[PDB]
Amino acid sequence: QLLAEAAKHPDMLTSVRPNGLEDTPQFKIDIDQEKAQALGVSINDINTTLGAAWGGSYVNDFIDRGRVKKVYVMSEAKYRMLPDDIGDWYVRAADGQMVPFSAFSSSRWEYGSPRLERYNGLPSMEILGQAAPGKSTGEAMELMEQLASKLPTGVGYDWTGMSYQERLSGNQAPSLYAISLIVVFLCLAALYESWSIPFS
Amino acid sequence: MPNFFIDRPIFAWVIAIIIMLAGGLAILKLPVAQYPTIAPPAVTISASYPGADAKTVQDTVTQVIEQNMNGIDNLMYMSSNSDSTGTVQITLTFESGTDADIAQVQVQNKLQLAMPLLPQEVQQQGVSVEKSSSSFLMVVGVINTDGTMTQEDISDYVAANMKDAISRTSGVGDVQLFGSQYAMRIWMNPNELNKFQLTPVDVITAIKAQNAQVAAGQLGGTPPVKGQQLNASIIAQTRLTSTEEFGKILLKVNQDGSRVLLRDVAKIELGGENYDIIAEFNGQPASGLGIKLATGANALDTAAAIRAELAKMEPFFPSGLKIVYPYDTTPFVKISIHEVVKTLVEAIILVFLVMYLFLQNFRATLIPTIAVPVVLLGTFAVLAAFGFSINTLTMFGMVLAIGLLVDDAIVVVENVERVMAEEGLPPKEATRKSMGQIQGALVGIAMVLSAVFVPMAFFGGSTGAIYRQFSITIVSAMALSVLVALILTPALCATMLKPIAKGDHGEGKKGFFGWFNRMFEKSTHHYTDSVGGILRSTGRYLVLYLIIVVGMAYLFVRLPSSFLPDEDQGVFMTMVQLPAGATQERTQKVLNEVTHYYLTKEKNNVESVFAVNGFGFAGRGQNTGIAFVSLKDWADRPGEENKVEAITMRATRAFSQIKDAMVFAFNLPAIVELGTATGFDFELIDQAGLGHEKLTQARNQLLAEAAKHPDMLTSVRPNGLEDTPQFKIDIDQEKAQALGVSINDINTTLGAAWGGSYVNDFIDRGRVKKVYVMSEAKYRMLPDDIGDWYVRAADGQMVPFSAFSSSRWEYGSPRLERYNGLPSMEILGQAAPGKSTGEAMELMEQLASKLPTGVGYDWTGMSYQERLSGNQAPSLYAISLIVVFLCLAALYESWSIPFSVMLVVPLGVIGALLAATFRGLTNDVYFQVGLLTTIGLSAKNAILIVEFAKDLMDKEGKGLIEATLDAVRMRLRPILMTSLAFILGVMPLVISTGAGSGAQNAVGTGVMGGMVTATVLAIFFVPVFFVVVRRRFSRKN
Amino acid sequence: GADAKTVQDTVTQVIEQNMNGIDNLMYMSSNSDSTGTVQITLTFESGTDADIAQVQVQNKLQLAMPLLPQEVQQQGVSVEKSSSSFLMVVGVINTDGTMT
Amino acid sequence: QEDISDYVAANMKDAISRTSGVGDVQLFGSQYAMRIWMNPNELNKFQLTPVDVITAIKAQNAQVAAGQLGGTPPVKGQQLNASIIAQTRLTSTEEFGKIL
Amino acid sequence: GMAYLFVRLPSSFLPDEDQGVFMTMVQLPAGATQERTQKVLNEVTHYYLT
Amino acid sequence: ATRAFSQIKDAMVFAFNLPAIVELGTATGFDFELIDQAGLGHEKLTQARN
Amino acid sequence: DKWLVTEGLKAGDRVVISGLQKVRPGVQVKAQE
Amino acid sequence: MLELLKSLVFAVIMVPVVMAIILGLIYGLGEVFNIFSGVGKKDQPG
């Protein structure tokens, strides 16, 4: 609704875009965990197989030109590309026989947002955007503040990063002229010896 | 050059008005709290090893940590404990003055010297290292009114929704829960594990494995094969998210699918990290926050927004959840932020009364009403560059300083009003004709005020942080009350005035004041007939004065050197203490009575009772318990009988009737370790390696020996716990393995049935919450239920514990404390009421000589404050005595000349010592500021009287006998306009009680009826102090 | 190699839940993703010492570490004062193609 | 030496390192650590490895979170609380002697 | 002229400095590979070098 | 000391004195590394030092 | 919630239950039941 | 604002009463300040 509200002002808000990525498909593998135990396999033979072949796993260090580098086990690339490559991974049962992942693990697909961006313990979705060529941020950020206060209470708008320091400039930089010049409005009476010369 | 601001006068007018908003920007920048950082910076390391007694968690956790603590900076006393709920709490009381943030991390990352040497359950549970003592801002009781939510049902709602959201709010530094949240309390039914031939190993080994998020891989990952167009992310076994999904955590299945779900061996439900705390709030169960200040203390904006951010949560409350505040810092100061401003406005009028007293004008009298509100907010502004805060030690420090900013206001307009009132010259020159002879004396109008802060940096510690809060307060009340009185106020004697007749005594004054202005003439001749008759009696009034000060030390030795008074802080803590090894059912049953006692017999005083079963500030457990008690505002209850000490002493009487519990109560300061007001707190040590029972016989011999001297060592009690029984199991190793078991199967059974073992975490509602396997209640509740636990042999035949685990009872102290790397015990103590603590500290040492080898003795709390300094009054107020001798000798330009202004020090302390008789308060720090407020102004009159005698020796050339007879007679008309110039400012300080009365009614009559010795009784002797100097040291012979 | 729905739950929600009253804070934003990377960004008040900050972040993280499921630090975590300005961002390339 | 180095360690070092003024105390010996001297012609007698000597000492000499009789939560209707002593970390050469 | 040409004067914070670099970011469909994103940065590099 | 320590065989016995900072020696004594960059190991670094 | 005893006590004896702080051996007892 | 109703009537009665007790002090005891009469000076250093 925000890009229904803020991207539809294309003159001023140029390229208002999100940061938090769209919900990619994620590949749920239902380890049908009783088959994954009735077949004879311990599941730690499975989660280590499923998660240090597809996964990539630190093992230990090694020495290389006298330098410590890591040791990574992983599947070779052409054996972890597809849901077909589920079926090629073999796990060992109790009695030493080998069982495939396609014998028990019933795969499927689901949503999932990779960039789960949080905020102090609150999930969030960051949104970027520039201002118009020839115009400024303050006539674009307050334009966003016309379009961020549209939403009801429940999902709030925050202004920070570069956006905090201009939200701080909007609270003290024209207000800098008050306490600066009033001291100057009181410097003159010391110099000119009258209340009325600071009127001039 | 003082008139460099006068030679164009509005060059002096505006600079004070510059302070009115260039300080006014910083008085809104300045944050509020009731109390500054009094406490020395402590570091509380809270380890937790659940289900293990003292001697375990002394050995597995505490001794490992205390071995590392060698190479850290600036500790006072590294106090500890180790109790039976498995908690360590070592407290590194550091040096005062040095910071916390550098000093916390120096002991927080060399706790990482031996984090692996701690067992991998306590470093799987918690070592939380805070930089805070017990200064809470407020406690927020969350309370279920209906009964649907239990106690622990509250606590995750506080954790998952409030703790983070309350710690969002500014000013909030630390947030605890008395919860904490829904750990998945895996129970175990040991007559169901034996059904399936399992142990608590395989329940753990499943849940550590079948409940574990896996590094699941990515389809189309890195690198791709050349020719890949699909990229997803795998979800492997998620951390399971339900009580029902742990239900189908698998166990042994056979090869034909005869499964064992874990819900057949476990009454799976959500629970707590520990049930060691059963809170209660008016009979119904509560959780609770505990909120602390952010360093950079904020209490105006914090608690106003802590409430305000809490106002977005009553739409989100479940059925009958209420929020109530059993404690709060701020309503102590939510009313004094307005009234101490409102007392000041009438104090302005009390100084405008002084302008209304003799002048009785309406345009020449606006000078103090504009001289005052410049100084009060500039007083904030300079300490806002010091960074210190408005507080009940500093707003009280400036409700005194509005007597100490007006006492220079209406003496230098009235010296100008004096000089214009015998020769009638206009104030345009009288602002110079007064200053032409005393220009080396308005560097003197704050010069004993320059001499009463130079050791106020020179107090260290807890009480040393108090004098600093009055130090820079009386330096800003020195500086910008004199830089508006040497510069502004002489220029303020030029414009708004109504100049007078030819030497106005007050000829044409018509009123009943004006006839009483001829009783202003009653003390014209009589105060001259005083000093003229004091000069005739100059030999018997010389020798009278050294024996009106014999009652000084005679009152001061019987004025007991106590500490800060017990304020009615609106709460009082009620401690229960059951017998040794009394269960949590009994304590709640006693806290049923004590809650029913504080409610149904004191409805009028007690707002409520937030009662925690199991918490002990003395030490947690099951036989202890605390009742946080909420009191009310004094607009709801009257009188001394409804103050704290009257409430608590009525309580402890009826607590003799409650059997099975040694119930009492007490009051709270900010710190809870200030002693017993003749306070010594004592850490008797073990040195040799005698164990604890040989150290215990030392306790049995010296707590008895403390009871053998009731004359000196009155209270004989330790803070710790009596040696409770604790239940040894002879896991019979040699028997056990021969029986066919392994030993690691035993201890993971025994240590996760009877203990409660953390396993891993699960995910409730997108929040990470613990998983504790534990035995059910009815199966770990007796020594008989040892035999119901079944442990798997080599082959898989089940083996009961009672086949191989004989058992026996024995002692054990379920809270062992430690001296710094050696065992110790917290011996409390009081000197007998109205005695010194230095002999009570020393007698304990030569009664610890009655105790055997390997026993040291050390101190903690305010006792290590006593260990560094007994009393810094006699020799470090000599540098408020000698430093007065050097400064005012510069004025008179003579050695032994300030020996006249040294004889108003007794005439200022006797007024302070008499207010301890006509009300009956003790020697506290606010009595020690009661000296410097009153000898701070006994000296300034003793400048104003006898520095005009320097005009009568270095401008006028009268003889010093009759120059003093002119220092009563020329000085005469300002005499009633100097002593009464201040003492009209102390007026609201009698009938104002409630919330710490004795700082402003006893010290109030230490400054109303205490300044009478310094204003209407010192000045009889002040002029003849000049001649009793200048009749022995006469340079006129 | 891990996911993102439960990289915030293994790693991030633990390090997020020690953040009791952050010393002169303005916001703490974190972002777990599909590569198993977490970047908890604690940004503080200006004028507050960045030197004490990286100290105090690992006195907020290392206030209350072993509320960590301890693999949180066993994988390798790196507190860093990421003033995300750089100096030169020197690239090192191969010209012929022998080195990958 | 080592008969002395613990007496420095168990008594002096924790008393000098909080003697006034003293910062870092660096002990120059050791604490009196139980030195299991294995004997490989006794291992070959009993057919063991140092693995089984380590696995036993990491088991029988292991302090256990033993729990409480009367622990929290109680059953409704309870009157007894105690703590349990499981296997204490064994305090002697003579008690490591009967490490099984 | 002051009061009308100040609130109508656009209120930015900092100008765009010609810093000699500019970052061009690419954003593929949800679930597009490192091969395909490289295949677009074939074009974008070929764009910025023709 | 050192002269009679020439008599002690089996050991290059010598002695010295402690300055305020003890890493210099005979009042000007410099100190110096010889680092390896190219992954040569230590013996080829030692052959550099030999 | 009751100990069973085989020796040490006889029938009809008056077991103290409530108040083991304030009762040292040899005090008057307001022995209610 | 009612304590400015106090300090209308109790800053006009508690200001003269403290002014009246000092009259009981400095004039009542001021008479006995002049009943005491004698010379006892030790002028020995001079």
Ligand SMILES: COCCN1CCN(c2nc(SCCc3ccc(OC)c(OC)c3)c(C#N)c3c2COC(C)(C)C3)CC1
């Ligand atoms: C092991 O716990 C250490 C915390 N202690 C100091 C803070 N404290 C305090 N708690 C509370 S209210 C309850 C907080 C609570 C909730 C549930 C609990 O059971 C889970 C629990 O005990 C753990 C405590 C109050 C008040 N009013 C006060 C203190 C502290 O004293 C005040 C008088 C300021 C008011 C509780 C005890």
Ligand SMILES: COCCN1CCN(c2nc(SCCc3ccc(OC)c(OC)c3)c(C#N)c3c2COC(C)(C)C3)CC1
């Ligand atoms: C912890 O060990 C590392 C400390 N190093 C610097 C200080 N240095 C020094 N150590 C010592 S005392 C060595 C004591 C000791 C005892 C038992 C031991 O067996 C475990 C042991 O071996 C470590 C050492 C002294 C002296 N005097 C000095 C220095 C150094 O010069 C001095 C003149 C100060 C005298 C010893 C080495």
